[PDB]
Amino acid sequence: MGLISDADKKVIKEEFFSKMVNPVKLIVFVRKDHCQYCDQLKQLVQELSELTDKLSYEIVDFDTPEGKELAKRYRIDRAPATTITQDGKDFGVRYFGLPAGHEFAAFLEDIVDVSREETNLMDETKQAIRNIDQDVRILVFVTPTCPYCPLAVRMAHKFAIENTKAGKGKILGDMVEAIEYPEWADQYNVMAVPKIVIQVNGEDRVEFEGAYPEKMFLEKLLSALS
Amino acid sequence: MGLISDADKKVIKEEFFSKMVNPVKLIVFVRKDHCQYCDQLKQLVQELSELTDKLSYEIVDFDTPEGKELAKRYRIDRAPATTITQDGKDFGVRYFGLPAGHEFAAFLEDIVDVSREETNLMDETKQAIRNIDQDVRILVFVTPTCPYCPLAVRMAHKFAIENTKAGKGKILGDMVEAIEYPEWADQYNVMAVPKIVIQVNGEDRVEFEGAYPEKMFLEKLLSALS
Ligand SMILES: [Zn+2]
Numbered sequence: 001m002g003l004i005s006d007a008d009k010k011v012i013k014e015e016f017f018s019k020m021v022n023p024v025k026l027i028v029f030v031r032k033d034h035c036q037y038c039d040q041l042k043q044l045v046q047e048l049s050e051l052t053d054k055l056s057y058e059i060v061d062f063d064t065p066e067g068k069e070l071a072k073r074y075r076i077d078r079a080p081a082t083t084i085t086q087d088g089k090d091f092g093v094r095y096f097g098l099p100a101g102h103e104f105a106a107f108l109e110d111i112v113d114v115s116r117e118e119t120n121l122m123d124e125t126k127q128a129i130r131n132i133d134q135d136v137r138i139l140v141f142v143t144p145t146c147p148y149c150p151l152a153v154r155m156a157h158k159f160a161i162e163n164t165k166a167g168k169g170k171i172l173g174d175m176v177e178a179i180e181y182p183e184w185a186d187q188y189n190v191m192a193v194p195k196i197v198i199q200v201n202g203e204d205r206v207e208f209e210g211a212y213p214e215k216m217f218l219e220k221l222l223s224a225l226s
Numbered sequence: 227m228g229l230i231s232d233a234d235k236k237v238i239k240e241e242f243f244s245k246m247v248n249p250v251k252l253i254v255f256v257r258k259d260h261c262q263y264c265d266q267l268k269q270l271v272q273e274l275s276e277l278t279d280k281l282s283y284e285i286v287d288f289d290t291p292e293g294k295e296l297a298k299r300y301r302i303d304r305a306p307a308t309t310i311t312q313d314g315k316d317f318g319v320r321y322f323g324l325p326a327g328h329e330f331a332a333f334l335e336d337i338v339d340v341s342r343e344e345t346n347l348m349d350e351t352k353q354a355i356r357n358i359d360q361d362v363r364i365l366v367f368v369t370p371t372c373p374y375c376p377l378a379v380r381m382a383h384k385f386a387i388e389n390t391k392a393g394k395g396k397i398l399g400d401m402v403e404a405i406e407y408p409e410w411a412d413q414y415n416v417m418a419v420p421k422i423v424i425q426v427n428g429e430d431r432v433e434f435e436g437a438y439p440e441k442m443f444l445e446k447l448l449s450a451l452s
Pocket residue numbers: 014015
């Protein structure tokens with residue numbers, strides 16, 4: 001039932017989904033082993049798609065040969081994962097795990113921006129991001145209780161949307177819910193969050209902790225591109 | 227080196243350790259397998275004991291038959307764990323994992339209260355806590371980035387100190403650093419923190435999320451004692 005209260009539904013419809021333009025499809029990858037919150041993720045996306053005719057979803061079994069083929073196409077290497085697409089078009093906007101806590105609002109805002117295919121990034125930032133031609137993966141490790149984590153996840157996602165808009169689609173912005181991916185978090189000594197890891201061509205280049213303002217965050221990414 | 231800066235040392239000495247009365251001994255349990263931050267914990271306690279002659283420590287290897295005997299005596303069932311004692315006397319004040327983030331200040335405050343063998347708990351709360359005669363274990367799951375988590379950990383620890391003072395010593399207040407104990411956190415569906423689990427006689431009785439004020443927190447514990 002109410003993973004989303006009826007009062008919440010009204011707010012979501014009025015303050016978020018009323019701003020949608022193009023149809024968005026939530027492609028969710030799940031599996032049978034080690035998916036503690038997979039059912040919650042499943043029901044969340046289903047309840048959200050009932051609030052508007054511009055939102056749809058597709059549940060994919062990562063364990064199947066079919067799911068593996070789809071994942072590869074969407075550059076997904078783990079499950080649970082959700083990529084927010086514009087009618088199936090990959091925008092590099094992904095969430096690994098459950099978007100709980102204030103990550104929920106970031107999830108909704110991401111849906112709107114992919115739908116609008118634009119962001120509120122500063123002009124200078126947009127110019128730089130749209131010029132990036134290298135494969136970049138931005139991992140943003142977060143925990144459910146983290147006031148500033150959403151800012152970092154949204155920044156990574158705005159970068160991905162703009163690069164996709166430019167026709168490159170080379171930036172992957174990945175929110176990673178640490179509680180659900182302990183081995184991955186441990187790999188990067190994640191304690192304080194948000195912890196950001198920028199990889200270029202599959203190799204680590206820059207790692208830092210904290211939600212940095214737009215200008216400083218951009219600077220970090222550009223420096224990793226050296 | 228500086229897990230603790232020299233400026234930090236001055237603050238610690240002046241605002242915390244200057245208030246100590248009786249000697250405190252930090253008994254730390256470590257192991258070889260799955261102790262990612264064991265070395266950091268080790269160096270932290272060693273650096274802290276250098277700031278005052280009223281603080282000492284003892285590193286115990288949980289893997290050894292000797293360490294297992296000591297752990298049993300200190301009611302420790304996992305490693306890494308640190309119990310804050312008054313010259314070796316068990317006060318039910320434990321930390322499972324690294325006291326990073328603002329848990330560091332809570333760690334220092336706990337050292338002072340065990341040293342003083344008293345707390346700032348309200349009179350009514352003290353009266354009720356000192357009367358508890360049942361075995362109670364309060365688990366407080368936290369993450370490094372969690373503004374209100376320290377409040378809950380300190381409340382659990384103040385309860386343990388008072389019950390020990392009363393001559394009962396039946397309350398165990400356990401801070402559990404979720405990142406380091408994922409299996410344990412998963413067992414209790416820990417997402418939002420702090421998540422509190424109150425067990426009486428080894429069995430779960432009450433589970434809730436959030437730092438509740440003193441009165442409400444006490445109410446929760448008493449209700450589990452029914
Ligand atoms: Zn409104």
